[PDB]
Amino acid sequence: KQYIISEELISEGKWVKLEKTTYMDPTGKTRTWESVKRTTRKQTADGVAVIPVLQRTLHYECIVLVKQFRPPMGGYCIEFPAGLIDDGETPEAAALRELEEETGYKGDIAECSPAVCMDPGLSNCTIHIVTVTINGDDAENARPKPKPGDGEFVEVISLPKNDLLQRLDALVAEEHLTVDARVYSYALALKHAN
Amino acid sequence: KQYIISEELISEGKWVKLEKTTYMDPTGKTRTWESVKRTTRKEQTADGVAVIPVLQRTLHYECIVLVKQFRPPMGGYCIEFPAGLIDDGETPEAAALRELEEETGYKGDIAECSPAVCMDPGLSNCTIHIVTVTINGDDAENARPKPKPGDGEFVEVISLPKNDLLQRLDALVAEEHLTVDARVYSYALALKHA
Numbered sequence: 001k002q003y004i005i006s007e008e009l010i011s012e013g014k015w016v017k018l019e020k021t022t023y024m025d026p027t028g029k030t031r032t033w034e035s036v037k038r039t040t041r042k043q044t045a046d047g048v049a050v051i052p053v054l055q056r057t058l059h060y061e062c063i064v065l066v067k068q069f070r071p072p073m074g075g076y077c078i079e080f081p082a083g084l085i086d087d088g089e090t091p092e093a094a095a096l097r098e099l100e101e102e103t104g105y106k107g108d109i110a111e112c113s114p115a116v117c118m119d120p121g122l123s124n125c126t127i128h129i130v131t132v133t134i135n136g137d138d139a140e141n142a143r144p145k146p147k148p149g150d151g152e153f154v155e156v157i158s159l160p161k162n163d164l165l166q167r168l169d170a171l172v173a174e175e176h177l178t179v180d181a182r183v184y185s186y187a188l189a190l191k192h193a194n
Numbered sequence: 195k196q197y198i199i200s201e202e203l204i205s206e207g208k209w210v211k212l213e214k215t216t217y218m219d220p221t222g223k224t225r226t227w228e229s230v231k232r233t234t235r236k237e238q239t240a241d242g243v244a245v246i247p248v249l250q251r252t253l254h255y256e257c258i259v260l261v262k263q264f265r266p267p268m269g270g271y272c273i274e275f276p277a278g279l280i281d282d283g284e285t286p287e288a289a290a291l292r293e294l295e296e297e298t299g300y301k302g303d304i305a306e307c308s309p310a311v312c313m314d315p316g317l318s319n320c321t322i323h324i325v326t327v328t329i330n331g332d333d334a335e336n337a338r339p340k341p342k343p344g345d346g347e348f349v350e351v352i353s354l355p356k357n358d359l360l361q362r363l364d365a366l367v368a369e370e371h372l373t374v375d376a377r378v379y380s381y382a383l384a385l386k387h388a
C-alpha cells in the first residue's frame with residue numbers, strides 16, 4: 001500500500017548522505033521524508049553487531065562489551081563489538097573478525113540474525129546481530145590480543161550476563177557513559193525473561 | 195582523553211542535519227567524522243522514547259506489543275517497539291505512555307525508564323529512553339483498543355508471546371518482506387538466551 005516514489009540527494013559526504021524521499025502514503029497522498037543512508041553499502045546489511053558470550057568455567061557467564069569515543073555522540077559509549085561488513089565478507093566472518101579486532105577474543109558462531117534496522121525513522125542502516133560464544137578457557141583467549149583498526153581506540157568491558165542491566169545502570173550513573181540501545185534492550189530482556 | 199573540538203554544519207533540513215565533526219583522538223591527533231543529528235531536540239533528555247509494552251492478562255501468556263509501519267528511510271515495512279519523539283517539556287514517561295496509546299490503543303502503567311541510550315552512535319547523536327510499561331489487558335479500557343494515530347501515521351499492532359518472541363519474529367520475516375528493528379531483535383534474543 002505504501003512505497004517509495006523517488007529519492008532526491010540533498011547532500012553526500014564520504015560516509016553518509018542525506019536524501020529527501022518522496023513516498024505514497026496509504027491515503028493516496030504524496031509525502032516526503034528526510035532520510036540518511038551510508039555511502040558504503042555493497043552486502044546483506046551495512047554492519048554486524050556481535051553479542052559475545054564469554055564462557056569461563058567456575059565463573060559467571062559474561063557479555064563482552066566495548067567502550068569508545070563516538071564523535072557523533074560527543075562522548076563515550078558502551079556497545080556490542082561491531083563494524084561495517086567488508087565488500088564480499090559474510091556477516092559471520094565480519095562478526096568474528098570485528099570481535100577479534102575490538103576485543104582480541106576468538107569465538108564461535110552460535111547464530112546470526114537477518115538484517116535488522118538501526119533507526120528506521122531516520123536511516124536505512126541495517127546490521128546482522130551475531131551471537132558468538134567465546135571459550136574463555138582455551139589458550140587463545142588467555143591474553144586476548146586486541147588488534148584495532150587505524151583510528152579505533154576501544155576499551156573492553158566484560159559484565160556478568162545474569163546481572164547485566166544492574167551493572168550497566170551502575171556504569172552510567174558512576175561514569176557518564178551512554179549505553180547503546182541494543183545493549184540496553186538485551187539487558188532488559190534478560191530481566192524480563194520467565 | 196578524547197573530545198569534540200568543533201562541529202561544522204554541512205546541510206540542514208527541517209528534521210535532520212549532517213555535520214562535519216572534528217575531535218581529538220587519544221594520540222593527540224585532530225581527526226574528523228561525518229555526524230548526523232536531528233534538528234528537533236530542545237531540552238529533552240533524549241530525542242525519543244521506545245516502549246517495551248508487556249501485555250498481561252489472566253490465563254494468558256505475556257505478550258510484547260509491537261508496531262508495523264512503513265518507514266520511508268527503509269523503503270518498506272518495519273516491526274518495532276512503539277516509539278515517538280518526546281515533545282517539548284514532556285517527560286520520557288508521559289511520551290512513552292502517550293505514544294503507546296496513540297500507536298496501539300493501549301493504556302499502560304509505567305514500570306521502568308532507562309537512561310538516555312544511543313541509537314547508532316557511529317552515525318548519529320540520536321538517543322531514546324526505553325520505557326518498560328505493563329498493560330493490564332483485563333481492564334475494560336484495554337479490551338478493544340483503537341490506535342488514534344497522528345497525521346502521516348499508519349500503524350499496525352502485532353502482539354507476540356514473550357515466551358516465543360524470537361520464533362514468532364522469524365515466522366513474520368519468513369511470511370512477508372519486512373525488517374525487524376534491532377532493539378526488538380536484541381530483546382527477543384535475550385529472552386531466548388535466558
Ligand SMILES: CNc1ncccn1
Nearest residue numbers: 032033034121122209
Ligand atoms: C527524520 N526524518 C523525518 N522526520 C519526520 C518527517 C520527515 N522526515
Ligand SMILES: [Cl-]
Nearest residue numbers: 053110133387
Ligand atoms: Cl549463547
Ligand SMILES: [Mg+2]
Nearest residue numbers: 081082083102
Ligand atoms: Mg567497531
Ligand SMILES: [Mg+2]
Nearest residue numbers: 083101102149
Ligand atoms: Mg574494528
Ligand SMILES: [Mg+2]
Nearest residue numbers: 276277278297
Ligand atoms: Mg512512532
Ligand SMILES: [Mg+2]
Nearest residue numbers: 277278297347
Ligand atoms: Mg507515533
